[PDB]
Amino acid sequence: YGLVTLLTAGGERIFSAVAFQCPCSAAWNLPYGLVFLLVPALALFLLGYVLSARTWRLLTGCCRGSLVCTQISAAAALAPLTWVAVALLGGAFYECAATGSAAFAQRLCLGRNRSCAAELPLVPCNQAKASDVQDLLKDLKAQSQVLGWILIAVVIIILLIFTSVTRCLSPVSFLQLKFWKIYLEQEQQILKSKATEHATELAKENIKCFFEGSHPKEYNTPSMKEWQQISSLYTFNPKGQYYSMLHKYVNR
Amino acid sequence: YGLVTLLTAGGERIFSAVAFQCPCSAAWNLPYGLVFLLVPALALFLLGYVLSARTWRLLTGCCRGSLVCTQISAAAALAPLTWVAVALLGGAFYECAATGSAAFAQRLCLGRNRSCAAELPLVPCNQAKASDVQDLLKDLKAQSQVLGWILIAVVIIILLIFTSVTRCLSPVSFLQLKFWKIYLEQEQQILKSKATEHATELAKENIKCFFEGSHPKEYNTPSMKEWQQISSLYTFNPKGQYYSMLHKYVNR
Amino acid sequence: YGLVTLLTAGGERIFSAVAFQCPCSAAWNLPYGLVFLLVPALALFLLGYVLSARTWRLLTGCCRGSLVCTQISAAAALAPLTWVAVALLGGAFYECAATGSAAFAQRLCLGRNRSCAAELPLVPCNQAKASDVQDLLKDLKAQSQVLGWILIAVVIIILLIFTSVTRCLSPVSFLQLKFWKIYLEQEQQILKSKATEHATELAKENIKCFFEGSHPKEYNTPSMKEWQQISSLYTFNPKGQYYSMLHKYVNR
Amino acid sequence: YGLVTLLTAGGERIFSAVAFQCPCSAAWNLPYGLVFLLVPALALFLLGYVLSARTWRLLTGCCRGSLVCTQISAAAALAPLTWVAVALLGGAFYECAATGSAAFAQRLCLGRNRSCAAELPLVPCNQAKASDVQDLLKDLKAQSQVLGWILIAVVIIILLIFTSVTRCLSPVSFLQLKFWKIYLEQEQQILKSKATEHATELAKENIKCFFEGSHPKEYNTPSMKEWQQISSLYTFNPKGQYYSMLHKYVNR
Amino acid sequence: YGLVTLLTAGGERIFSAVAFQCPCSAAWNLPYGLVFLLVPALALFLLGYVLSARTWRLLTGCCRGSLVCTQISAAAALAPLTWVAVALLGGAFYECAATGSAAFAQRLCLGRNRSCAAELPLVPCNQAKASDVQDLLKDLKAQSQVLGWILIAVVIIILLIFTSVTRCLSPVSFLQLKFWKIYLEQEQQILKSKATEHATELAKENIKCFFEGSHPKEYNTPSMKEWQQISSLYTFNPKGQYYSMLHKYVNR
Amino acid sequence: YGLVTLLTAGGERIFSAVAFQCPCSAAWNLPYGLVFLLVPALALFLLGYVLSARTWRLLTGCCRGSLVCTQISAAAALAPLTWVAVALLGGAFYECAATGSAAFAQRLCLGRNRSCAAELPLVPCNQAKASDVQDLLKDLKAQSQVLGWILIAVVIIILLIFTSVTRCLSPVSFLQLKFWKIYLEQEQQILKSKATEHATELAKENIKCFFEGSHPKEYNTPSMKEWQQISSLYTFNPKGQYYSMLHKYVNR
Amino acid sequence: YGLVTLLTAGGERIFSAVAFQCPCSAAWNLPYGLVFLLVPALALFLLGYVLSARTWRLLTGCCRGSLVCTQISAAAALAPLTWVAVALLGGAFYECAATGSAAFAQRLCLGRNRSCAAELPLVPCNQAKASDVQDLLKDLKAQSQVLGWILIAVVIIILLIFTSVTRCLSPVSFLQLKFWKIYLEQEQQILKSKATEHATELAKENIKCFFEGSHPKEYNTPSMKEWQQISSLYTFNPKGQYYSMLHKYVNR
Amino acid sequence: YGLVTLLTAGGERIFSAVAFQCPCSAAWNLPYGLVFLLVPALALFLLGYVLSARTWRLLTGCCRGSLVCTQISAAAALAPLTWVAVALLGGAFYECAATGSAAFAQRLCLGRNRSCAAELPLVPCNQAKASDVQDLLKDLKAQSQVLGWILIAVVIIILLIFTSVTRCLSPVSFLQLKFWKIYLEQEQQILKSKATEHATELAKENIKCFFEGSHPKEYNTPSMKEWQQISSLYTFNPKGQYYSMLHKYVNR
């Protein structure tokens, strides 16, 4: 129960602290909103760029290269656009971005009060009492929500076009592509299991020879150059079907 | 419990943020309502256009074609019309679409206050106090609900006519069509299972030959051209009953 | 828990949105009530006309015919009358239908205020304050509930007469009719099961021959013309008892 | 959980809609109460007249007959009298029936206000403020409850006399009648089970002969005329004890 | 859950409708209270007169007779006196019976206000404000509770005397009477079971002979006159101990 | 759940109806309290006089006798004194018995107001406002509680003396008396079981001979005079230890 | 659930009725408090004097004797002192005993108001408003609590001294006394079990001989004089260790 | 559930009755606080002096002796100091002990009001309104809490020094002392079990010889003098290791 109580207390503290006031300030407010827009987005973008095992396979070993890189970058950049869309639909952040550069303000307000740019930043702060800006906050909320929805539409459209073209120009057919993906899944699980038990037997034998203090068995040697050889990425050629480069490396 | 608490917090944030104020604005309001009508509808339309495995079979491989395309498009377009109907029945969105182009306003209001078009947009905003428009918001709600119900009737009617004609002109009878669909279902499940275990044995053999470092078995080769050959779509001819083109491809 | 929470949220949104205000309008109100009466009724009528497997058997195959058609139409039209009865007993819809054509209003009001037809539509809206119409709304509620109950009586009476005559003029007796229906039920379940397993073996054999790449077995052929032949509908003749036309088709 | 939530919502809607206001109207009120008394009673009467399997046995086959018909009609009419008794004990319905024909009103009120018949119908409506009728509503409630209880007494008395005479004049004794009813119960269950499995074997054999496409077995024929012969109703004669006419039909 | 919800709704409706107002009326009130006293009592009396299997044994077969009849009538009349006692202890009913015939009123009130009989019936109605009757309602409540308790004492006394005399004059002793009752209980259960299985075998044999269409077995015949012979009631004679007349009928 | 809900409703009705107001009346109040004291006490006394199987053994068979009768009467009269003690400790009943005969009142009140006997009965009714009686109600509550506790002491004392003397003058010792009571308990249970199964076999044999219609077995006869002989009560004599007269009746 | 509901209702009634008001009365109050102190104490004292099986062994059989009698009386009188201590610590009872004889009052009050003895009894009643006695109630509460605690100390001290001396002068040592008590416990349980089964076999044999009606077995006779002989109490002599007089009676 | 409900009711009564008012009295207050300090402490001290089995071994048998006596007294006096410390930390008791002898008061108050000793006792009673004593109650609370904490420190210090010296001067080492304590624990449990079963066999044999009435077996005799011999206390000598004097008594 200790973990549960500490976690609820931590969550409450975290959220009460991330309370978003949108400080009404003449010049320090724009970055305040901008970081709450971009920085968590950049964070999730980086974590996506990290998590996928597809990129590490290419990166390791002392670092055509465009296609794979843009593919992985988009497959990871899926999510940060979702965060920025959800946030922009939250309305608070962009409403806080109202001030921005003075150009936004001068172009923004209808020019009714003739005193916009001076203390417009008070408009999400609710402290200004001029009727014009009290109506302008609403229009800013509108622009925020609309821009957010337009972005979440553009992202889904781009995902469609990307995956459709990637499914259109491949040489292999569909009903074979499904079987191929099932194959690679099974290969990964089998590799995990059997490599696990083989490392287990290696460790057992060597550690027993150490406890006794005698010569080892010398059963076999997994070649390191062979390991690097099977880490290749592309895994396709029209002639040598040979999926999963490991499987391709059984002819020699 | 962490997932549960985070999900409820996320849901509450999401819904409190998608709070729909319908900002009363002279010109920026129309698109505000229009995107909340169309964009989620377009989103669900695209996801439907994506999800069904029937279309990918046709699309892959470097892209009469009308019939299958309109069939799949309608079978996927079922749902977006449901979203737009539910939303239009919500009333808020179309009520927000009241303003639109000025033509809607000039034709819309009874001309009582003679000051409609100037600040009609305040009518869902509840800020205008002229009696005429305070009554006009109600009529707009009515037009919204009625249009929504008419649309949800037209969509069900169209679905009826579509599925009835598609069931009317087919050469095969009913009690055989049911058995045929059961057959294709069983074939899909059997294919999944046996292809899974065959890929499993392939991976096991090849990965063992790799761990040992010796020649593979060369059991058999699933031909890629054969795979593409069995991905065909139509699966009917009056003479060669041969359902499920895979099954049709057993004569040669 | 995600499904549960999303479903309760969706239900609350759906019902709060289907909130029925009965907009008080001089001319746009009548259709508002009329669609909420008829359209869901038409919807349930269509779904009934769709769901029953009895009609598809007749319809498929390029489309005395009166009797079966009216039987199926009534057996499906059972429910829409129930919806319209429940709704009319709800009172709100017909109360909203008060205005209708002006003929209803002129014949309706007792002529006390002499100003009925002008702004009677306000009477379910509760905005009119003339005593005469404030009493007239009550009488309209009465007419609604009474008409609803009369309809729900007429529908049960018609169902009685229909099923009684259909049970009266049949040649077969009762205690045999029960056994016959049990027989057809068992036949349907047996057909489902055995056709399932036979399609399973067909798919298994053909898919194995495909994986290997060799000739199939050629066990037997379910004739398509035979399938259509056994899809017949009537299933009765005084001489050849032969229930369930499939069973009738065992003599030749 | 979906069914549970939808059912509670439906029940709440149904009951809130069947809210009984007893509209105070000069002439349209009497039928309003009368239908809520009679129509659900007629409904339950019809469902009783339908549900019992005893009547269908007599009715089917192209339609002394008095005794069985009055027996079944009373055995089914048990319940509608219970509904009308419960409703009359509810008090609202008969209180609404106060107005009725003017004869009821003129005979009803004590003649104190001398203005009864004009706007007596307001008396359950609570809108009239004359002391005489405000006391008269109470007496009407009394007459309702008393009449209801008298009816629920008369119905139980009639049930007593009916079942007692039916138990008095039968030739067979009691301790044998109990065993006879147990016998018929067991016979019904055995018939259900064995007819079920026999229809199952019939369907299995015929459907296998169809799948193969060969001649059937011709095991035996349940004669339809025999089926009608065993559907007889009376099942008694002093000489040939032979309960359950099916059992009577074993001599020839 | 449907049954549970419908039952609680029905119970609430039933009890809210059986709400007992005791309408204050000059002449229609007395029967109002009297029926709520007697009619449910008569109902439970009749159900008791029905339920016991002891009376049917005597009644069937075309209808000393005093003793058995008064015994069964008292054994069933136990409960209605309990209902009337509980109700009279409820106080509301007899308080409503205050008015009754005018003789009760004239003898009842102390004659203080000299205006009792005119509008005494208002006294449980709480509408009369004369101090004398406002005190008289209390005395009436007292008379009700006291009479109820005296009745519930008289009924228990009568039950004592009845069962004691019935236990006093019997020829058999106690420790044998207990064993005799255990015997009859076991005999009833054995008869139920074995008659059940024998009717089961009868039905099975006859229904099989019907399905096949051949002659029955003719195993044995339970004689109907024998059945009536064993339905006798008295079951005692000093010489032929022979409990349970069925058992008495084993000598011939 | 039906039983649970009906029972709670019945209990609430029962207790709300047994609400004890102690009607303040000049002459009808004394019996009101007196019956609520004595009648339930008499009821529980009678049920005790009934329940014990010890008395029936003596009573049956056409009805020194003092000792057994007073023993059983006291062993059953234990409880009614407990009821009257609990009630008297309740205080309400005796407080209601304040008035009683006028002698109690004249001796009771201190004579301060000189107007006691006229309307003293109002003193538990709280309607009288003279200070003297408002203090006198408290003293009456005191007399009630004290008398109750004195009675509950006298009853326990009497129980002590009774059981002690009954344990003092018996000839048998203690450690043998315990074993004797265990013996009689075991004998009762064994008799129940074996008599049950013997009656079961009797019924089985006779009912089988009836179903077949043949002569019975004539196994043995439990003599009725023997049954009465073993129903004797005293079960002691210094010479023939022979507990449990049944056991005493094994010598001849 | 019936027992649970009835028990909670009974408990609530019991405790609400044992509500302790301490009636302020000039002379009837002292016994009111005194009985609530002594009588339940006497009750628990008597139940203790009854429950212990040690005293009955001495008492039965037509009634040095000081030591055993005072031992058992103290071992049972443990609890009543606990009740009186808890009650005296309750404070209400002794506070009610304030008045007592007039000597307590005259010695009690400081003599400030000079009007103590007249209406001091009002002091726990809170009705007197003289400051002196309003302070005197507090001192009386103090005297009550202090006396209670002194008594609960004296009782524990006496228990200590009693059990210590009883453990000091016994001839046997400790580690043997523990084993002896374990022995007597085991002997009691063994006696219960084996006497139970022996009485069971006795009853079985005799009741079978009765059912058959033949001579008994005459296995053996437990001598009654022997039973009394083994009921002796003291169970000690320095020479013949022979615990548990039953065990002592194995030499002859 | 009865035990649970009675226990919660008893606990509530007990605690509501032990409510501590600290009666403000000039002279009767000091003992009031002093008994609530000392008497429960003395009680727990006595129960500790009783419970430990170590002291009884020394005490029994007609009563260097200093060391064991002070050891057991301290090991039992652990707890009463804890009670008095907790109570003194409660603050109420010592605050009530404020008055005490007049010397405490005269030395206590700062002499500001010059009227301390007269009615200082009102200071925990909150009835005195002089500012000086209203501040003095706080200082008294302080002195109470501080003294309590100093006492709970002194007791832990004394326990440390006691157990450390007792662990310092013993001849045996630690790792052997632990094993010795484990040994004595196992010996106690083994003795309990085997003595139990041996007493069981003794009782069984003797009670069987009694039931039969014949001579016993005379298996063996546990000598009473031997029992006392093995009850010795010290259990140590440097030469004869022989833990657990019972074990020491195996040489002769």
Author numbering:
A (entry chain E), B (entry chain D), C (entry chain C), D (entry chain B), E (entry chain A), F (entry chain J), ...: 20 to 82, 94 to 282
The paper states:
In humans, the CALHM family encompasses six paralogs, some of which function as non-selective channels that are permeable to large substances such as ATP. We identified the three paralogs, CALHM2, 4 and 6, to be highly expressed in this organ. The CALHM subunits thus constitute unique modular building blocks that assemble with different stoichiometries into large membrane channels. In contrast to previously described CALHM structures, where the oligomeric state of individual channels was described as uniform, our data show heterogeneous populations with CALHM4 and CALHM6 assembling as decameric and undecameric channels with similar abundance and CALHM2 as predominantly undecameric proteins with a smaller population of dodecamers. Despite the unknown activating stimuli, our study has provided insight into gating transitions of CALHM channels by showing two conformations with either a cylindrical pore of uniform large dimeter within the membrane that is constricted at the intracellular side as in case of CALHM4 and a conical pore that continuously narrows from its extracellular entry towards the cytoplasm as in case of CALHM6.
As in case of CALHM4, data of CALHM6 shows a heterogeneous distribution of decameric and undecameric channels, but in this case with a prevalence of the former amounting to 60% of the classified particles. Both assemblies of CALHM6 contain subunits with equivalent conformations, which are better defined in the smaller oligomers. We have thus chosen the decameric CALHM6 structure for a description of the conical pore of a CALHM channel. Unlike CALHM4, the lower resolution of the CALHM6 density of 4.4 Å, precludes a detailed interpretation of the structure for all parts of the protein. Unlike CALHM4, there is no dimerization of CALHM6 channels and the C-terminal region following the cytoplasmic helix CTH instead appears to engage in intramolecular interactions with the outside of the cytoplasmic rim for most of its length. Upon comparison of decameric channels of both paralogs, in CALHM6 we find a slight expansion of the protein parallel to the membrane and an accompanying moderate contraction in perpendicular direction. In a superposition of the subunits, similar conformations are observed for α-helices TM2 and 4 and the C-terminal helix CTH and larger differences in the interacting helices TM1 and 3. These differences are most pronounced for TM1, which in CALHM6 has detached from TM3 and moved by 60° towards the pore axis around a hinge located upstream of a conserved phenylalanine at the end of TM1. When viewed from the outside this transition thus resembles the closing of an aperture and it converts a cylindrical pore to a funnel which narrows towards the intracellular side while creating a large cavity between TM1 and TM3 that becomes accessible from the cytoplasm.
